[PDB]
């Protein structure tokens, strides 16, 4: 269960509308996520279409290969995610450009439709369609499949100096990614936390790993109400970090030490 805890800057954290803006920019959305159906037509006349449904759409709009790639976007998921036909087509342009023509219907239309044409190829369109659904990224940070809006109760001193509670909004996400999410404007880049300490070591270094390792062990022990004195968990994590990298408590870690052979062979 890889997970990030993403605290937000104070001015944003007490305004739910601004936090939702941050939410939609972090969340990974592919083209596959918003696509309801794809179609392959034989449309031999480039200026017209056999499809009566797209008749009024393409005829008024206009005022290469005969094979047509026609994909339909789902209105509900496009509306919720706050995506426009334009910006979806923009991302397509940079990765496809001149090779693929792009034509979109209007949002007022009964069905939201995007037409594509190339400018033996029966299978090449199936391979391209596979290539499209598997790689086009519309926005967001890769690896962040879902973002949760979580309320934190954090104790902060008053102006009078008395400790009072204070509700603040933060985010929590599925998947693992720390470096890219830290850089995102809006995110408090000095406090973002991940429950994968392997990733922490690559981003923040060994001393941050010592603190993160302790936090994750303590959370496990303290959960069923138990309490173990600090020095014991502290002792375990110093052993796990003394070499500068994470030495696992398995044969592959323990027996890579310069300890005597009789000691090592007894494990």
């Amino acid at each position: 269960t890889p997970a990030l805890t993403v605290y937000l800057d104070r001015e944003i954290a007490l305004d739910i509308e601004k936090a939702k803006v941050i939410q939609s920019s972090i969340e990974y959305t592919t083209l596959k996520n918003v696509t309801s159906a794809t179609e392959i037509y034989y449309d031999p006349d480039p200026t017209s279409t056999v499809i009566e449904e797209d008749f009024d759409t393409v005829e008024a709009y206009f005022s290469q290969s005969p094979w047509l790639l026609r994909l339909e976007l789902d209105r509900a998921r496009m509306l919720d995610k706050q995506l426009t036909m334009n910006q979806v087509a923009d991302k397509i342009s940079e990765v496809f450009s001149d090779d693929l023509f792009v034509m979109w219907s209007e949002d007022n239309a009964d069905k939201l439709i995007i037409r594509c044409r190339v400018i033996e190829e029966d299978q090449m369109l199936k391979r391209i369609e596979a290539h499209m659904l598997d790689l086009i990224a519309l926005r967001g940070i890769p690896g962040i499949s879902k973002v949760y809006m979580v309320k934190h109760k954090v104790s902060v001193p008053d102006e009078s100096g008395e400790y009072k509670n204070e509700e603040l909004w933060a985010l929590e996400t599925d998947g693992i990614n720390l470096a890219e999410v830290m850089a995102v404007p809006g995110v408090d880049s000095s406090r973002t936390y991940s429950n994968s300490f392997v990733e922490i070591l690559s981003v923040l270094g060994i001393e941050a790993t010592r603190s993160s390792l302790y936090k994750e062990i303590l959370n496990v022990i303290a959960f069923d109400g138990s309490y173990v004195n600090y020095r014991h968990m502290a002792l375990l994590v110093d052993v796990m970090t003394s070499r500068g990298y994470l030495m696992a408590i398995t044969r592959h870690g323990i027996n890579r030490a310069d300890t005597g052979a009789l000691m090592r062979c007894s494990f």
């Binding site: 020095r231 002792l235 003394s242 408590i249 300890t259 005597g260 007894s266």
Partner: protein, 48 residues
């Protein structure tokens, strides 16, 4: 009954690896915490 019978061996293995990882760690007379190689694990036990 299955859980108690199964997961007792899971935690039994956990304790065995932990003991072998840590068995040689001793407090020395200068206050440092060291293993049998004399590597420093903590400069002062428990930081206090």
């Amino acid at each position: 009954l299955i859980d108690t019978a199964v997961k007792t061996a899971e935690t039994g293995y956990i304790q065995r690896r932990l003991v072998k990882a840590l068995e040689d760690i001793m407090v020395h007379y200068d206050g440092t915490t060291r293993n049998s190689l004399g590597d420093i694990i903590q400069f002062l036990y428990g930081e206090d």
